[PDB]
Structure 1
Amino acid sequence: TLEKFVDALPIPDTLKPVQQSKEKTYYEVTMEECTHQLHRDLPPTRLWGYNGLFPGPTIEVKRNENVYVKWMNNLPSTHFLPIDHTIHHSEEPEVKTVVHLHGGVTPDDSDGYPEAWFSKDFEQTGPYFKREVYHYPNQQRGAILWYHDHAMALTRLNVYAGLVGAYIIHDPKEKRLKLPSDEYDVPLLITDRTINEDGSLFYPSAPENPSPSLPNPSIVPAFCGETILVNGKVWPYLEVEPRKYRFRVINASNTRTYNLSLDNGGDFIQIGSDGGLLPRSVKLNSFSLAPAERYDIIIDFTAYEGESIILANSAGCGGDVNPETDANIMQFRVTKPLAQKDESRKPKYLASYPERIQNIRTLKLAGTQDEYGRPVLLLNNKRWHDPVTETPKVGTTEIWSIINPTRGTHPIHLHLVSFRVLDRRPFDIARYQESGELSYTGPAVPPPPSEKGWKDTIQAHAGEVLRIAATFGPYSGRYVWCCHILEHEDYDMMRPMDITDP
């Protein structure tokens, strides 16, 4: 149905501070119901948005800028998407919110803990709530971060509703690299959605072929949207100048993984991963992008003046990709006149490369089944509410060995830290399931170049052990690690992570 490439790509405006001095920058962001048209041929869609915008405003900060954001809830008391009351037990408000700055090196009470939620005007607050005004010291590498809702049992719904936005940390020490900047540095927040004829968002209230005993609504274990949006617009086009652009590619989708290419066979240059600039730039013809991953890339349109180039997708969601729909992301049109000379660069040398092993943690990804027969996905056999087990000591380095005996990939995220990827190694799934015994079926494989820098969300593929290494700090406190497939996260593939200080 919806005609591709008829609406221009929105570029969210950069948020202006309410107050700013040399010592402190203070922002206010209020979650509001709002209405926006997502495609030329759709009626406007009721959404929830940060400052009533979808996506939310892009926040731009400097490394070490002392930033505060008062994230406020001015949402209705009843949700518009289907709440499953059976997935969590503790009366509480139906609509609960909390903002997680994904990738932030953030004090624990500003990290957006799932039980630090709040209702409208903070009238009711969860048992881990401490503060209204979140503090982001930004003492971390320049990078693409993003912010999104993280409320207990509601994350998949609140994010789907529209509560996502970009947050960019600029390190002045990188300015000398002359990477494309300003108008030539564009975030691309990719979100798949299913939209009804009347313009309303569709989110399933049950899996296919439910029983009458099955809760209604019921959580589903995965969501694949019919349409692809970039920056809140269905299959948009972007007019570009014939020169180099930097794009901050963010997968803000609930479940869907992308595998991106350019339909002319042209290359990307990757310059950065979740945790900042790679040590060296990486020429790529394609890349996978699972939920919450970011690729910081340069696309050089210099030789392509007048051309239309599709950012294409080869990964299916619930089936093979459809050439007419989800195989398309957006269309670049190289038809904008040059505003000035391209004085940007695509340097090879970007940053220095990524220490004692304190602990090695072996962690399994697996599910159980509930009383209604639905899968409940768990991190190392535990529910969210079980006593904490992942308890690294502050200032120490650990290796985490993530065993995935399930049928699909899980994008695992650690809060607070970024980590290095050591290797992946295939193992005998049936043996592991039958006995707990890990028997490798092949040699360990080091990460691709794209994963030789710093990561915070990482694909743990089926039938493999993935090893990562992280140094836990600089802060101690109560954080989280989770699978970022939101349908998994909410039931119940998330755990507390305590970074302890003796």
Structure 2
Amino acid sequence: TLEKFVDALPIPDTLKPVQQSKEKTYYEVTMEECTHQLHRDLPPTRLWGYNGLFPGPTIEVKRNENVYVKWMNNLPSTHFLPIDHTIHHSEEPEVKTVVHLHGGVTPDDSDGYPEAWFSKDFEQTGPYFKREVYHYPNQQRGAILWYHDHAMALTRLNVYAGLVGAYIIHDPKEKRLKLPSDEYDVPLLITDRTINEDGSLFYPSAPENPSPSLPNPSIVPAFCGETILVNGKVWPYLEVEPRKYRFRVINASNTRTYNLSLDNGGDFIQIGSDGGLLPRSVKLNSFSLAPAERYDIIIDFTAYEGESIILANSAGCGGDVNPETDANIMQFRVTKPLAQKDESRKPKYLASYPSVQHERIQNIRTLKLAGTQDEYGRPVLLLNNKRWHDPVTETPKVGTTEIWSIINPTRGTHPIHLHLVSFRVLDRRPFDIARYQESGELSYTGPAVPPPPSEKGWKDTIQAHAGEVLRIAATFGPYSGRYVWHCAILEHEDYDMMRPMDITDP
């Protein structure tokens, strides 16, 4: 297996507009079969990429920039990854695609609804499709967003194939904080993969111990890659200057949760969560990062000139972490000479607090993380006992604020994500699990615990741990329409831990 730290980290180019005016910015991105080398010692890999790139081009926008992206499909009619035709019921094309701007404050027909998919040149289109050219008005806080495929029953596959990319919102009012910028502001999209000797992607076509019950192919409830990539390279190194850098850390992995640290025991400074700048910077030695979460951090290399510091990982996936493989993410080498004085800062005071506003509670939704079992013996994961196709039940009123109480009686954590909104985190609290499943009755086995400082700002994707109740608060708006919410573990999302979320007007 593969030598760590032999390839330089790619930094995806910033996409140039096809057309741009003071009034609007117009982009085109076309999904393409392409080939790229993921490691010095691998034959080139066949992948699917936005504009033929893996990752996709980084998109950079200003707050309130009036942006249009025409997302196009120029992919083969047949997939190269194992499709399990038994998981959702229809004839439709095999390959369907739709692009979701994760974290985007987006009108509903531009949010990438799972059933607004389209095939090559939009020849066929799912029943919720309305438009070719998506509109992102970016009337939101500066933040790290990312874009990826969201097609019904295909998300885990189309993302694994390479359909991911970063999208950054710059709010000019933050410039005065003098945070590291430009070359010193670098996205890190982390994706675990398993790669065959011939260089092709491997994604499992059935679980461990294929019971000869199951279909072929069969969806699996979890995927753990043998290798870790950052920005499309296996275990890369990045040469940095001895100074402060900002990194936009994005977990673009299907299932895997990371728990990140530096091997010299040095510290990160977190300045931002999914929803933007935290009110105050937080010094951390480590942090958890589940699928779809984003951490905006500063790493201060000033005193570590000449050193090699590994970005390490302690969280296992399907087993204890292996020191020689998945315990490693990437390696910094502090050997780039300074291009100029480091005029960047690491302030304490970042932004006005979340409860700067008084909201009033319209509704309290109690939501259970559960899971029946299917025809073939496989676990099916469900939000509050509903399938995706059942009539909508999460129906908040535009303009109003709800508390959502997520109850997780399962043995694992679920990163729950809501489209459109970001939200504050209130608390987590433990409970009698056997009692909850035996009777449907909820008894707390300890006090409510507030979030850690990492989670005191704005979030859109949030870890709900086993045996706990998580409470979040969201004001739903500013758009009304048809959106979704789901577990961000893609293997779960596709079967069937995803439900519609209607935000109503009258």
Report if TM-score (shorter chain) is over 0.5. yes
Residue 157 of structure 1, CA deviation: 0.1
Residue 214 of structure 1, CA deviation: 1.1
Post-superposition Cα deviations, 1:225-261, rounded to whole Å, max 9, x if no partner, equal 0000000000000000000000000000000000000
Post-superposition Cα deviations, 1:26-73, rounded to whole Å, max 9, x if no partner, equal 000000000000000000000000000000000000000000000000
Residue 439 of structure 1, CA deviation: 0.1
Residue 211 of structure 1, CA deviation: 2.5
1:392 maps to 2:428: no
- Secondary structure in structure 1 of the residue aligned to 2:438: helix
Residue 286 of structure 1, CA deviation: 0.1
- Secondary structure in structure 1 of the residue aligned to 2:436: helix
Post-superposition Cα deviations, 1:275-297, rounded to whole Å, max 9, x if no partner, equal 00000000000000000000000
Post-superposition Cα deviations, 1:387-430, rounded to whole Å, max 9, x if no partner, equal 00000000000000000000000000000000000000000000
Distance 2:471 2:340 in 1: 46
Distance 1:264 1:376 in 2: 42
Residue 371 of structure 1, CA deviation: 0.5
Distance 2:142 2:113 in 1: 24
Residue 127 of structure 1, CA deviation: 0.2
Alignment of 1:287-326 (within 5 A): 287-326=287-326
Residue 209 of structure 1, CA deviation: 1.3
Distance 2:5 2:283 in 1: 27
Alignment of 1:288-437 (within 5 A): 288-354=288-354, 355-437=359-441
Residue 212 of structure 1, CA deviation: 2.5
Which residue of structure 1 lines up, in the alignment, with residue 88 of structure 2? 88
Distance 2:433 2:297 in 1: 36
Residue 213 of structure 1, CA deviation: 2.8
Distance 1:229 1:210 in 2: 28
Residue 16 of structure 1, CA deviation: 0.2
- Secondary structure in structure 2 of the residue aligned to 1:292: coil
1:477 maps to 2:456: no
Normalising by structure 1, what TM-score? 1.00
Distance 2:326 2:198 in 1: 21
Distance 2:212 2:344 in 1: 61
Distance 2:433 2:5 in 1: 44
- Secondary structure in structure 1 of the residue aligned to 2:121: helix
Count of aligned residue pairs for this structure pair: 502
Distance 2:49 2:90 in 1: 28
- Secondary structure in structure 1 of the residue aligned to 2:173: helix
- Secondary structure in structure 2 of the residue aligned to 1:175: helix
Post-superposition Cα deviations, 1:295-353, rounded to whole Å, max 9, x if no partner, equal 00000000000000000000000000000000000000000000000000000000000
- Equivalent residue in structure 2 for 1:501, among 477, 502, 505: 505
Distance 2:481 2:321 in 1: 42
Runs of 4+ in 1 over 3 A off after TM superposition: none
CA RMSD for the aligned pairs? 0.3
Residue 208 of structure 1, CA deviation: 1.1
Distance 2:431 2:180 in 1: 43
Residue 90 of structure 1, CA deviation: 2.0
Alignment of 1:241-256 (within 5 A): 241-256=241-256
Return 327-336 or 207-216, whichever deviates more: 207-216
Q: Percent identity at matched positions?
A: 100
Distance 2:8 2:90 in 1: 46
Post-superposition Cα deviations, 1:358-403, rounded to whole Å, max 9, x if no partner, equal 0000000011001000000000000000000000000000000000
Consecutive unaligned residues of structure 1, counting only runs of 5 or more, are none
Post-superposition Cα deviations, 1:75-104, rounded to whole Å, max 9, x if no partner, equal 000000000000000200000000000000
Distance 1:171 1:14 in 2: 17
Distance 1:71 1:164 in 2: 13
Alignment of 1:1-12 (within 5 A): 1-12=1-12
1:61 maps to 2:65: no
Residue 210 of structure 1, CA deviation: 1.3
- Secondary structure in structure 2 of the residue aligned to 1:188: strand
Post-superposition Cα deviations, 1:179-203, rounded to whole Å, max 9, x if no partner, equal 0000000000000000000000000
Normalising by structure 2, what TM-score? 0.99
Residue 462 of structure 1, CA deviation: 0.2
Consecutive unaligned residues of structure 2, counting only runs of 5 or more, are none
Distance 2:205 2:90 in 1: 22
